[PDB]
Amino acid sequence: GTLKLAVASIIGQHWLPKVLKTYVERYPNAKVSLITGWSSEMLKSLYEDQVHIGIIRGNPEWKGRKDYLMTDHLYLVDTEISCIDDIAHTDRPFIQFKSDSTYFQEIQHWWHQKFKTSPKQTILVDQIETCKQMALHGIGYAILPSVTLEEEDNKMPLLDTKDHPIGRDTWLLGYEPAFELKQVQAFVSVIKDMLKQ
Amino acid sequence: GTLKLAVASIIGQHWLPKVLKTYVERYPNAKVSLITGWSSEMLKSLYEDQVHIGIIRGNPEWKGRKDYLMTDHLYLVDTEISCIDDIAHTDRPFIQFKSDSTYFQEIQHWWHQKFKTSPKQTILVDQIETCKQMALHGIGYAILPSVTLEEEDNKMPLLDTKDHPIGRDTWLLGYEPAFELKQVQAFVSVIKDMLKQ
Ligand code: NA
Ligand code: NA
Ligand code: NA
Ligand code: NA
Structure with a gap:
């Protein structure tokens, strides 16, 4: 199944490629589509069903699942x-x-x-x-x-x-259904499995 | 005072710093406001008078001044x-x-x-x-x-x-009123100087 991400720009550029490297490395041939931008634009994207997961910055108000990820x-x-x-x-x-x-x-x-x-x-x-x-x-x-x-x-x-x-904080947002879907689970996995450091 | 630029992303990142470095070196304290993005977005922003100059890739049609800059x-x-x-x-x-x-x-x-x-x-x-x-x-x-x-x-x-x-080509775009401004002319000058390098 194809993972549809919205990631804040600096995250997309600097943090995510190691994440995607391991995700690709243990799940060959798994599809990923990635849009980037301002947190606000990716939040708005997430809200309107265009993506599974949003990786947002700041303190987004969100009435679905929200995972603290990191701070810099x-x-x-x-x-x-x-x-x-x-x-x-x-x-x-x-x-x-x-x-x-x-x-x-x-x-x-x-x-x-x-x-x-x-x-x-x-x-x-x-x-x-x-x-x-x-x-x-x-x-x-x-x-x-x-x-x-x-x-x-x-x-x-x-x-x-x-x-x-x-x-400043980075979070991982998404509605419940997305977290039901599998590649989302393998991706959230890879993230939380990576962050072990 | 205050140059408003709209610039295709990779140009913004990879080519424009050189140019702004010189522009600032030559006109200290000149205000510069930069927006970046897809070529279509920057052309739109230029079409709507939100900026002075656009730097745009591809082959934009343009009923104003169009300067070829470069190919890569x-x-x-x-x-x-x-x-x-x-x-x-x-x-x-x-x-x-x-x-x-x-x-x-x-x-x-x-x-x-x-x-x-x-x-x-x-x-x-x-x-x-x-x-x-x-x-x-x-x-x-x-x-x-x-x-x-x-x-x-x-x-x-x-x-x-x-x-x-x-x-792929990269062009510099504006309407005639912009090119009458001292800061647009200075910027254009720094550009056409830099292209000889
Ligand atoms: Na934002
Ligand atoms: Na510096
Ligand atoms: Na475009
Ligand atoms: Na490509």
């Missing part, structure tokens, strides 16, 4: 700047992801509460991986979730006013 | 397979990108013509970078435009029945 944390990245305080004075441009989720407002709030000022809006982008690439090309600094980071060329954790890392 | 060529990539004839038997999955552009149709047509059979619709993905990533993780093989490839990690040129590389 916000990092400021730049090629030059090594000290997060420096960004208050920086003239290096700020490369901001903005969508309809809370991501953007969370960062605006952290910034307002950390530096007692507004961040300069210069570069606005609508997808997170683009912000990452533009940061990796030295254009400016970005704030990315650690699920999108590796041994790439400076990463500085965001901590709130009480020294706590911020702060 | 299709490669079959896989971690195991070295020889592109084998792909007709391998039973490794074909990770296949599919949108409402003609990318998919054109690869289908090539497949049918070259191998005289059909390809196995197992994995279907809605963004190209995810095919790349899924291919880089050994899941299966992918057909990717070279604008998304580097000295990476096994690539075999797609050639039509008369041994000519199969290509």
Whole structure:
């Protein structure tokens, strides 16, 4: 049977391929169709019956099954700047992801509460991986979730006013019937079987 | 002030950073607002005056200014397979990108013509970078435009029945009023400078 997934974009790109590798590896010839996007768009997709499973970010309201999956944390990245305080004075441009989720407002709030000022809006982008690439090309600094980071060329954790890392969840949503279907069960399996680490 | 761009995804990821790096290097503190996506979506967004400039792949019809930018060529990539004839038997999955552009149709047509059979619709993905990533993780093989490839990690040129590389074009689009703006002209300048490299 054919598994129809809706995955948030950064998840689709960075976390899911190891998941799908093992899923393909123990279930040869099993079909997978994958749509990606903003959590909001994939939630809306899931709701309207287009997919079996949604892998959504944030805190989606959902009246079916919802599995917490994981949590990651916000990092400021730049090629030059090594000290997060420096960004208050920086003239290096700020490369901001903005969508309809809370991501953007969370960062605006952290910034307002950390530096007692507004961040300069210069570069606005609508997808997170683009912000990452533009940061990796030295254009400016970005704030990315650690699920999108590796041994790439400076990463500085965001901590709130009480020294706590911020702060973002990934869930697995779906209605009951989907979890009745088998390949969904083998996929949820592979996920929870993988996460054993 | 404030350039509003709409850019096909792989361009946004792989080619545009270079260009924005220079655009910023040359005009510090110039505001840039970027949206990304399928070529059809970015053309729509441009058609509706939501942006200044669109960068669009394929062969868009356009009753305004259209500049050809570049061509790139299709490669079959896989971690195991070295020889592109084998792909007709391998039973490794074909990770296949599919949108409402003609990318998919054109690869289908090539497949049918070259191998005289059909390809196995197992994995279907809605963004190209995810095919790349899924291919880089050994899941299966992918057909990717070279604008998304580097000295990476096994690539075999797609050639039509008369041994000519199969290509895809990328264009820059706008209506005349946009091209009168100093920031659109500066951006276009950085672009037409960069194409000589
Ligand atoms: Na969203
Ligand atoms: Na940077
Ligand atoms: Na399109
Ligand atoms: Na493809």
